Chains A and B, each alone.
With several copies, the nearest count.
Chain A
Amino acid sequence: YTSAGNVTCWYQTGIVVPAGTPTSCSIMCFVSACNDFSVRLLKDTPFI
């Protein structure tokens, strides 16, 4: 129901800290397009 690729992330080790540090941590993600990108057939946008 996709027929698309996917990306997953797995704990290899786990996070090791010293004493007197915060507990939780966070990951952020950025997306962009590489140099070759083609678009065709200008249409209406389905957002408004």
Chain B
Amino acid sequence: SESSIENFLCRSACVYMGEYHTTNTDTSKLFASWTINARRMVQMRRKLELFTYVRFDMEVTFVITSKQDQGTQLGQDMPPLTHQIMYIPPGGPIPKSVTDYTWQTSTNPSIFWTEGNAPPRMSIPFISIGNAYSNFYDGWSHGVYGYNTLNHMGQIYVRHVNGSSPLPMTSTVRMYFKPKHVKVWVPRPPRLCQYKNASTVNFTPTNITEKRQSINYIPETV
């Protein structure tokens, strides 16, 4: 009953930790970004490789902290900061800067939040025109091996909701991920190799198990 599929997988984990600033000279360090694939968190990856097709809902909680730079200016009296967290479905537009029009589009679901309150949280349905996600794919996209276009699940963008010419602060986000209502099909043998990259199944040859003294060896009874 503790070996049920739901108790084995319905558990939370930190999957991404990014940093983003209020003012900078880089314009890519002004927002935080993460493509959502289930092959780049090594926590849940090996537990999912026991199965061939999976189907679940997704629940995401956010933990956000800030600090003021140690550059020059003290004596401030700042109000609490506001943060925007935008989810893009598979097939939506992608921003390029924090001042883009794409932060304001009516079809990207977004969350606004101010510090001191409870941490924010939203839930995602099973978003696939297919009938299940695919942990394994033996074939081509149309041409990249192993990758198909049915495992698109979206992206996450975070920025500050300041006005104009803000004060210099730097923020950090932790994204916590959790699957719900999980169903699996076609079990597979476990991975007896260390993972090399986050896209393929490539590996180096490793031994089957560890050695002992002889085929008759049994350690002494205490």
Interface residues of A (CB under 8 A from B): 1-3, 6, 8, 39-42, 45, 48
Contacts and interface: CB of A to CB of B under 8 A. Distances in A.
A2 B7 contact: no
Given A1-B220, A2-B222, A39 B42 contact: no
Contact of A3 (B46, B191, B195, B221): B221
Interface of B: 2-3, 7-8, 42, 46, 191, 194-195, 216, 218-222
Contacts of A40: 2
B221 A48 contact: no
B2 A3 contact: no
B192 to A, nearest CB: 9
Contacts of A1: 219-222
Contacts of B219: 1-2
A41 B3 CA distance: 10
A22 to B, nearest CB: 21
Nearest to A37: B3
Contact of A48 (B3, B42, B222): B42
